[PDB]
Scaffold this active site. Structure first.
Site, PDB file in Angstrom:
ATOM      1  N   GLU A 116       0.937  -1.116   0.087  1.00  0.00           N
ATOM      2  CA  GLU A 116      -0.065   0.051   0.036  1.00  0.00           C
ATOM      3  C   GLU A 116       0.791   1.276  -0.052  1.00  0.00           C
ATOM      4  O   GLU A 116       0.449   2.302  -0.608  1.00  0.00           O
ATOM      5  CB  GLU A 116      -0.955   0.027   1.183  1.00  0.00           C
ATOM      6  CG  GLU A 116      -2.018   0.856   1.341  1.00  0.00           C
ATOM      7  CD  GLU A 116      -2.404   1.544   2.826  1.00  0.00           C
ATOM      8  OE1 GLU A 116      -2.601   0.666   3.472  1.00  0.00           O
ATOM      9  OE2 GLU A 116      -2.473   2.939   2.853  1.00  0.00           O
ATOM     10  N   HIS A 117       1.958   1.160   0.479  1.00  0.00           N
ATOM     11  CA  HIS A 117       2.859   2.456   0.543  1.00  0.00           C
ATOM     12  C   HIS A 117       3.258   2.748  -0.851  1.00  0.00           C
ATOM     13  O   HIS A 117       3.538   3.657  -1.195  1.00  0.00           O
ATOM     14  CB  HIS A 117       4.076   2.240   1.655  1.00  0.00           C
ATOM     15  CG  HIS A 117       3.874   2.603   2.884  1.00  0.00           C
ATOM     16  ND1 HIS A 117       2.953   1.573   3.589  1.00  0.00           N
ATOM     17  CD2 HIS A 117       4.056   3.565   3.873  1.00  0.00           C
ATOM     18  CE1 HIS A 117       2.774   2.093   4.788  1.00  0.00           C
ATOM     19  NE2 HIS A 117       3.527   3.231   4.873  1.00  0.00           N
ATOM     20  N   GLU A 154       7.055   4.846  11.311  1.00  0.00           N
ATOM     21  CA  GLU A 154       5.804   4.950  11.620  1.00  0.00           C
ATOM     22  C   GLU A 154       5.144   4.109  12.730  1.00  0.00           C
ATOM     23  O   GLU A 154       4.247   4.121  13.515  1.00  0.00           O
ATOM     24  CB  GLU A 154       4.935   4.697  10.347  1.00  0.00           C
ATOM     25  CG  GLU A 154       4.849   5.683   9.465  1.00  0.00           C
ATOM     26  CD  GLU A 154       4.233   5.164   8.201  1.00  0.00           C
ATOM     27  OE1 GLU A 154       3.599   6.027   7.688  1.00  0.00           O
ATOM     28  OE2 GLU A 154       4.654   4.083   7.662  1.00  0.00           O
TER      29      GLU A 154
END
Ligand SMILES: CCCCCCCCCCCCCCCCCC(=O)OC[C@H](COP(=O)([O-])OCC(O)COP(=O)([O-])OC[C@@H](COC(=O)CCCCCCCCCCCCCCCCC)OC(=O)CCCCCCCCCCCCCCCCC)OC(=O)CCCCCCCCCCCCCCCCC
Ligand SMILES: CCCCCCCC/C=C\CCCCCCCC(=O)OC[C@H](COP(=O)(O)OCCN)OC(=O)CCCCCCC/C=C\CCCCCCCC
Lengths: 54, 445, 418, 49, 106, 57, 47
Positions: free
Chosen positions: B59-60, B136
């Protein structure tokens, strides 16, 4: 003080023989002991509530 | 003019299908903007212990450049027309979607097809997305609510794929190669597992021909095409306690096992959780509120907040509550909350059920306000129920709930059952598990 | 269909209604009140008024308002700016008549009882400490105090010395002088136009005109620095621009999107933002940068907002300010102007999709201008902005007198005269 | 003035609680004669003599 | 509510006020009320000058009863000067309790 | 003509009866979060931020 | 996220070691067994 004078009457009647004047007295004083606590005392407090404008 | 007549005039959803199995759904609503996206059956419950950070890594890289539009050229095209790109990843779903003007629909569908089919997983964007993901993870440790719900899944589903986290452990993030990401897309980004949804100023005939132009080269049946095996997951009554006295407030989550997505018990269990409610210290209602747990916590200043949840998976789920309080208040909050669960298993009145049905009707229509939540409801209902359930059908299921139904379903799921508990912070006054388990039955009834 | 029905009453009230065929309804009352209308003796009265919507009124007690709204599943919320307050009610279509009656008791006949107001004073401290966990909130309140001498410098939250001392007589005086019918607008979203009107003729017995003129705001070129223990430095640098509803205000809106006004792609590198690209040439560390635009009825502010680390804060502010100087001396392409008009057009149409954004948009137009304009008219006013007006709005910023507010570790942050 | 029993919502007060008590007014005729050394229910059944 | 006994029944009210003797201790009628939960909420809602007057009048009467003494007759509380300072605050507290009780059964 | 939220940047607070208090519109403006280590701290009067305002029903 | 529950397999009952289901079912069995082991005690202390 009517209730205190009613318990003095029952203490005197309870040492008397079971004869003519001490049965009509000893059984009306047994009634008035319950009539003061249950009926006469709650009605009289309500009457005094109305006289003080609450 | 009537709420009953207004549920009839809601526009319906039209569903179609291509030759490869891709479903295409729409709702037209006569407005100059639209939201279009792709919803996929993929998530961390389809990963094993070797590639637990694989779907979140992909997804990144989804907006970092494809074969036709390399690097920042995808980002310049979305911005120059005034459009927005977004994505998310849960334990069972993955979505990418675009908010744009309704006359930019052919360009929007073309960019979405290039994202999911021809994304370049280039080896220099990897090894620089590792450090973004590793930073993150350290930011996620400061969010106490996200940590305590990760603890609740890890202890309720201990030795199953449903106990893993979406992000995956830090040692997996350091070692995921380029080969593991190309295997993840080939095994999971497949056309009968995808839904193309759209809401706003869209015609269904136009979206269908755009889907045949850009998506028809998706592989329909696969090399050897074995059925995607579905291992279910079992619930375990257990607890996990993380003691840290330097934190100022304590977080506690507790749940029993709940029903799956297609179970019809889900509707009266949401009427029941709406009777318990939610509370927060910035509320203006306070001591006058209808919920008993909310009115007690405002009068005695017992907590900062609480909430009830209903998490559903395909076959199982979690049904419970979460609260935040200080170190002297944990035993009283657990006493009053467990006493409200037992008071719905017995004793539930008809006047509570009328209020709880009105709350659920208002929460269903308030969600579907705007093109983006309507488009997300289309994309995940076709992966969950196989169809979109209209608002008139939700109302006829809500209308057949009464007080004896709520007593039967709450007794089935709450009464004399083992819960799962998670706790974090200054939690020395969190009660023993034997005293918590004894709180799930009464003396009398 | 049935686009909007717009009506002026003879006492000055504005009524607007659009008939949806949606299962939910929405009623909003919009008032010219808020923190710009208080003076130095009653600071914080409008913050306490915002928190007091559940208290006892003449038509309903505080028990009946909480229980009666929760029995049908409805909501009641208040929202405020420096120039307006808005009272909103939402529920399903068949319950809207009895929640319209609760909304009129809150705003047109409140009681401020002594023991209820005294118990609410401690909510001011909770509400302010929740809001100030965001470092943007206190930087933006210091920025309005640095920029004005009066009447826009007042904070949205109560000052600390004043918590505990807002009196019931001050709340009665504020509503009497600022909640009047020529300062108000009533907007409906799922109700017909005859129903809102006879609702509106039940608050006109008092509040017949305009209540109190506010002072015109005077620009101060000040500076407020706040040293604390935060890990990043927040700074803002503005100048005076233009009031809302003018041709120069449209040129500053286009200039904001030329420079950069927030991101479009999740975790993107902001490729079309000329402010973000100029800072990131020399700075190789975490930062953020944006263009700031605040427009009010008689004044406005425009400038830059940076978030940076402590040792790098002077490099971020100087390189951001130099990029605005290049536009002011003529470096501007028509490709970048056309791309900025697309982001401004698409953002306006997306902000009016929901019922919440559409109702706020009609309410602001009714108080500021007293009419409604179709979004086709708004899209043609953006098209008429020329390239010469974007350069002329960047020249007003460069040659104008500055204001500044900063917070964090300020050992490398420059002073506004440097 | 004990009219808290007289309400139109708490009539279901007694309908969730009496299905417990289907035997509970006669458990003294089941349970106390276990220790009385009488013959109250000891003639009812040929279970016990 | 009889118009013929308008003055006669006010004679029995004035007689009962003097037969009761809280006015000999310098007390008002609302000083003598029994403090249940509704009365204790009405005392908390009094303004600060009426609260401080009530606290001193009660302390002066408790001190007189300790000594078995009364006040001089010119300092007794008059019948048509007795202020029912607590009665508006108590009628509102009771109305709020009866509203929460009709809601709990309907 | 328009709101203060259209020409974005000046902020607004809300109070609800059954929902949480919100501050501003563009105060948590992002790509300060994709640059590393932007932590929201633990609070003493802490609040729910999603705050039922986007619930599925 | 680096925190997971250690393995409990040498303490589990036989019905819940399969690690695939027996979430809801075979739950009335395993607590109905351990309620009979205590219900005999009360009539065993009644007499
Ligand atoms: C302790 C000592 C007793 C311990 C020994 C145990 C003995 C038990 C016993 O036998 O009973 C004693 C006990 C004595 O009572 P007490 O506790 O000493 O008297 C209480 C005080 O009067 C209490 O004071 P008081 O305030 O109640 O006075 C009563 C009243 C009455 O006032 C008076 O009548 C005068 C009081 C002083 C009496 C001095 C008499 C002088 C001659 O005074 C008032 O009217 C003032 C009330 C407020 C009105 C406003 C006026 C402002 C002042 O019982 C009796 O009454 C006598 C019975 C004795 C034989 C018992 C068998 C009964 C047949
Ligand atoms: C030793 C006797 C063992 C008997 C088993 C436990 C008896 C109570 C069963 C609880 C039924 C459910 C009650 C509602 C749940 C609840 O939270 O009640 C609060 C409250 C707290 O206890 P629990 O939380 O239930 O802890 C049980 C842990 N297994 O429950 C109560 O029962 C009230 C406390 C009285 C318990 C009596 C203690 C045991 C009595 C025999 C021992 C004698 C010495 C102990 C002192 C008692 C007085 C002399």
């Amino acid at each position: 003080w009517m209730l205190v004078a009613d318990l003095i009457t029952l203490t005197w009647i309870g040492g008397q023989p079971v004869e003519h004047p001490f049965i009509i007295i000893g059984q009306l004083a047994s009634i008035l002991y319950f009539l003061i606590i249950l009926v006469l005392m709650p009605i009289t407090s309500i009457i005094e509530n109305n006289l003080l404008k609450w | 003019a009537t709420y009953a007549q207004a549920l009839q005039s809601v526009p319906e959803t039209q569903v179609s299908q291509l030759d490869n199995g891709l479903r295409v759904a729409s709702e037209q609503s006569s407005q100059p903007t639209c939201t279009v996206g792709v919803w996929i059956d993929a998530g961390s419950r389809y990963e094993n212990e070797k590639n637990n950070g694989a779907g979140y890594f992909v997804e990144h890289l989804a907006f970092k450049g494809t074969k036709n539009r390399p690097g920042s050229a995808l980002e310049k095209e979305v911005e120059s027309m005034g459009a927005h790109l977004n994505a998310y990843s849960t334990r069972e779903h993955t979505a990418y979607y675009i908010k744009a003007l309704s006359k930019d629909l052919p360009k929007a569908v073309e960019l979405l097809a290039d994202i999911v089919q021809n994304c370049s997983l280039e080896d220099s964007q990897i090894e620089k997305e590792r450090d973004v993901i590793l930073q993150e993870l350290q930011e996620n440790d400061s969010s106490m609510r996200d940590v305590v719900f990760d603890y609740l899944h890890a202890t309720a589903f201990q030795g199953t794929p449903l106990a893993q986290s979406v992000e995956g452990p830090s040692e997996n993030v350091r070692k995921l190669s380029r080969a593991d990401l190309t295997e993840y897309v080939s095994q999971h980004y497949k056309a009968p597992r995808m839904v193309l949804a759209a809401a706003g100023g869209v015609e269904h005939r136009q979206l269908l021909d755009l889907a045949q132009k850009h998506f028809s080269s998706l592989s329909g049946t696969y090399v050897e095409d074995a059925v995607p095996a579905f291992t279910p997951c079992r619930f375990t009554g257990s607890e996990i306690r993380h003691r840290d006295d330097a934190l100022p407030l304590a977080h506690v989550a507790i749940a029993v096992e709940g029903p799956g997505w297609a179970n019809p018990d889900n509707v009266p269990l949401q009427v029941a959780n709406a009777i318990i409610g939610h509370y927060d210290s910035t509320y203006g209602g306070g001591t006058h509120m209808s919920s008993t747990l909310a009115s007690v916590a405002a009068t005695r200043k017992l907590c900062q907040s609480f909430q009830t949840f209903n998490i559903c998976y395909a076959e199982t789920g979690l049904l419970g509550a979460h609260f935040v309080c200080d170190n002297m208040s944990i035993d009283d909050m657990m006493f009053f909350l467990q006493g409200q669960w037992m008071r719905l298993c017995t004793s539930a009145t008809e006047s509570e059920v009328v209020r709880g049905k009105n709350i659920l009707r208002n929460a269903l229509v308030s969600h579907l306000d705007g093109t983006t939540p309507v488009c997300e409801d289309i994309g995940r209902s076709l992966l969950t129920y196989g169809r979109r359930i209209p608002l008139a059908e939700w109302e006829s299921r809500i209308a057949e709930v009464d007080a004896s139904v709520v007593r039967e379903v709450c007794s089935k799921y709450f009464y004399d059952q083992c819960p799962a508990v998670a706790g974090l912070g200054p939690i020395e006054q969190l009660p023993d598990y034997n005293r918590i388990r004894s709180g799930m039955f009464w003396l009398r009834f | 269909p049935q686009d909007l029905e717009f009506t002026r009453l003879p006492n000055g009230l504005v009524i607007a209604s659009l008939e949806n065929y949606a299962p939910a309804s929405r009623i909003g009352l919009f008032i010219k009140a808020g923190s710009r209308y208080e003076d130095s003796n009653n600071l914080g009265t409008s913050h306490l008024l915002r928190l007091a919507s559940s208290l006892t009124t003449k038509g309903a007690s505080s028990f009946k308002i909480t229980r009666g709204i929760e029995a049908v599943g409805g909501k009641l919320s208040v929202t405020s700016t420096r120039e307006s307050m808005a009272y909103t009610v939402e529920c399903l279509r068949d319950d809207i008549e009895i929640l319209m009656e609760f909304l009129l008791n809150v705003t047109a006949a409140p009681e401020f009882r002594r023991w209820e107001v005294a118990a609410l004073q401690s909510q001011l401290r909770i509400d302010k400490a929740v809001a100030f966990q965001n470092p943007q909130a206190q930087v933006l309140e210091n920025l309005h105090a640095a920029a004005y001498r009066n009447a826009l410098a007042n904070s949205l939250y109560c000052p600390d010395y004043r918590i505990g001392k807002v009196t019931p007589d001050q709340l009665h005086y504020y509503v009497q002088n600022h909640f009047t019918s020529a300062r108000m607008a009533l907007i409906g979203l799922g109700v017909s136009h005859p129903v809102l009107k006879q609702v509106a003729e039940r608050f006109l017995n008092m509040r017949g005109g305009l209540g109190l003129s506010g002072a015109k705001a005077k620009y101060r070129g000040g500076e407020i620095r706040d040293q604390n223990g935060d890990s990043l430095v927040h700074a803002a640098l503005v100048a005076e621009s233009a009031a809302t509803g003018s041709a120069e205000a449209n040129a500053f809106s286009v200039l904001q999107h030329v420079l950069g006004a927030g991101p479009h792609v999740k975790r993107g590198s902001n490729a079309t933002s000329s402010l973000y690209q100029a800072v990131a040439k020399g700075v190789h560390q975490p930062f953020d940068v944006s263009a700031f635009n605040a427009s009010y009825s008689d004044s406005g502010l425009f400038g830059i907002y940076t978030i940076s680390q402590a040792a790098s804060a002077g490099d971020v502010i100087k390189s951001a300010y130099d990029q605005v100087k290049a536009i002011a001396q003529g470096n501007l392409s028509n490709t970048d102007v056309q791309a900025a008009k697309n982001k401004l057009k698409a953002g306006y149409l997306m902000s009016v999709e929901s019922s919440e954004g559409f109702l706020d948009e009609v309410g602001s137009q009714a108080l500021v201008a007293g009419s409604y304009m179709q979004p086709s008219t708004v899209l043609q006013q953006i098209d008429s902005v020329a390239d010469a007006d974007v350069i002329n709005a960047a020249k007003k910023f460069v040659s104008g007198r500055k204001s500044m507010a900063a917070s964090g570790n300020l050992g490398h942050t420059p002073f506004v005269d440097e | 003035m004990l009219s808290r029993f007289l309400g139109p919502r708490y009539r279901e007060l007694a309908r969730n609680w009496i299905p417990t008590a289907s035997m509970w007014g006669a458990v003294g005729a089941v349970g106390l004669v276990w220790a009385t050394d009488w013959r109250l229910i000891l003639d009812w059944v040929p279970y016990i003599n | 509510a009889v118009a013929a006994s308008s003055k006669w029944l006010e004679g029995i009210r004035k007689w009962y006020y003097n037969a009761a003797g809280f006015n000999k201790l310098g007390l008002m009628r609302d000083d003598t009320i029994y403090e249940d939960d509704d009365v204790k909420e009405a005392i908390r809602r009094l303004p600060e000058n009426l609260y401080n007057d009530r606290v001193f009048r009660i302390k002066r009467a408790l001190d007189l009863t300790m000594r078995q003494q009364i006040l001089p007759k010119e300092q007794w509380t008059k019948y048509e000067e007795d202020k029912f300072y607590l009665e508006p605050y108590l009628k509102e507290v009771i109305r709020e309790r009866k509203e929460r009780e009709e809601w709990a059964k309907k | 003509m328009l709101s203060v939220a259209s020409r974005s940047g000046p902020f607004a607070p809300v109070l609800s009866a059954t929902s949480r208090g919100v501050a501003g519109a563009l105060r948590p403006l992002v790509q300060a979060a994709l640059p590393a280590t932007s932590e929201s701290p633990v609070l003493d009067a802490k609040r729910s931020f999603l705050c039922r305002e986007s619930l599925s029903g | 996220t680096d925190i997971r529950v250690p393995d409990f397999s040498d303490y589990r009952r036989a019905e819940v070691l399969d690690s695939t289901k027996s979430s809801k079912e075979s739950s009335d069995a395993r607590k109905g067994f351990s309620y009979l082991i205590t219900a005999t005690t009360t009539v065993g202390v009644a007499y």
